[PDB]
């Protein structure tokens with residue numbers, strides 16, 4: 449199991465969501481965040497942090513590469529600021545209503 | 559050390575908090591998020607993302623199973639949408655005020 | 669690659685940002701959160717969760733100790749509530765605009 453955390457442009461949420469759902473994703477969490485990247489000592493009057501959305505998608509390992517490709521293709525515009533993806537390990541997943549775990553708590557297959 | 563990330567119904571925060579504190583938890587972070595799960599191509603007029611709270615609780619490994627059980631018991635209602643828990647590894651924890659690490663930065667025992 | 673998650677006092681954002689940028693950091697994400705720590709059964713009228721900012725900084729492993737030290741030095745005040753840092757593994761990083769990975773998606777060196 450892995451967590452895919454994708455930081456995207458806010459306007460891209462629905463395009464990314466549709467891509468993910470059509471690829472078989474059946475869960476995801478979205479956070480409002482602000483950030484900076486490489487910015488191709490500070491100011492008291494201006495703000496370097498830009499609004500983004502943080503998508504968190506917990507998947508099985510066999511899904512990761514597909515998910516990444518779907519996100520990148522849907523989120524990209526070609527302009528600096530398109531976002532960044534971080535993949536990290538997940539040890540266990542539990543569905544609260546039922547107590548089901550791992551693939552049972554993630555998968556479209558029940 | 560592990561991070562327990564629990565996505566719960568907003569109204570359940572205080573019931574879950576009380577359960578955790580009574581089980582000996584002495585730290586946690588809460589985020590406002592939106593999400594979807596299995597939803598037992600999109601719309602321009604309606605919103606599939608539902609408001610939830612993201613609880614992040616960093617614990618020692620011996621605490622994990624207890625914490626999960628306390629969260630599930632307090633958060634559950636039986637209706638779809640009760641939430642989901644993800645456990646992930648933590649390599650190091652540091653308390654900023656003192657520089658203490660790991661168990662010293664987590665534990666109720668000082 | 670590691671994720672450094674630093675929970676800090678809101679007023680400290682710019683001091684911490686400046687320290688990180690001067691140490692060579694060229695990316696970070698900030699979240700509004702609420703939390704509690706050790707609090708040196710609840711109430712219906714009062715709120716134990718305190719506003720904090722969650723900084724997420726994905727770095728290469730050689731940067732971690734420097735980053736931690738910069739954060740702690742900039743964020744500390746000496747009063748309870750100064751914050752907490754969690755370090756966790758990252759398996760892969762992808763820049764959305766270009767598809768670059770790992771160090772190429774993190775580093776100041778291109």
Ligand SMILES: Nc1ncnc2c1ncn2[C@@H]1O[C@H](COP(=O)(O)OP(=O)(O)OP(=O)(O)O)[C@@H](O)[C@H]1O
Nearest residue numbers: 455483484485486528529530531695696697726765
């Ligand atoms: N190393 C990082 N750690 C944590 N968050 C980051 C990091 N780099 C970028 N981010 C997040 O991703 C968002 C988008 O970054 P952005 O797309 O500008 O990256 P970039 O490296 O500057 O690439 P580009 O050249 O395409 O702009 C940032 O606003 C921030 O929220």
Ligand SMILES: Nc1ncnc2c1ncn2[C@@H]1O[C@H](COP(=O)(O)OP(=O)(O)OP(=O)(O)O)[C@@H](O)[C@H]1O
Nearest residue numbers: 475476477506545565593594595596638639640641
């Ligand atoms: N795989 C996932 N990855 C990331 N976040 C998820 C995932 N699945 C669910 N979530 C988060 O958990 C919240 C609650 O999900 P929910 O309880 O509806 O899960 P479910 O799998 O549909 O189970 P149920 O049948 O009990 O509804 C979602 O709104 C989202 O924030």
Ligand SMILES: Nc1ncnc2c1ncn2[C@@H]1O[C@H](COP(=O)(O)OP(=O)(O)OP(=O)(O)O)[C@@H](O)[C@H]1O
Nearest residue numbers: 585586587616655675703704705706748749750751
């Ligand atoms: N174990 C934990 N898991 C998750 N978040 C935590 C944990 N401990 C603290 N936090 C987060 O860090 C914030 C700051 O905690 P705080 O600095 O009060 O920690 P503390 O352990 O009480 O240390 P101090 O004695 O310096 O107050 C909390 O409000 C919460 O957001």
Ligand SMILES: [Mg+2]
Nearest residue numbers: 485486528529
């Ligand atoms: Mg950029």
Ligand SMILES: [Mg+2]
Nearest residue numbers: 595596638639
């Ligand atoms: Mg559901």
Ligand SMILES: [Mg+2]
Nearest residue numbers: 705706748749
């Ligand atoms: Mg405290």
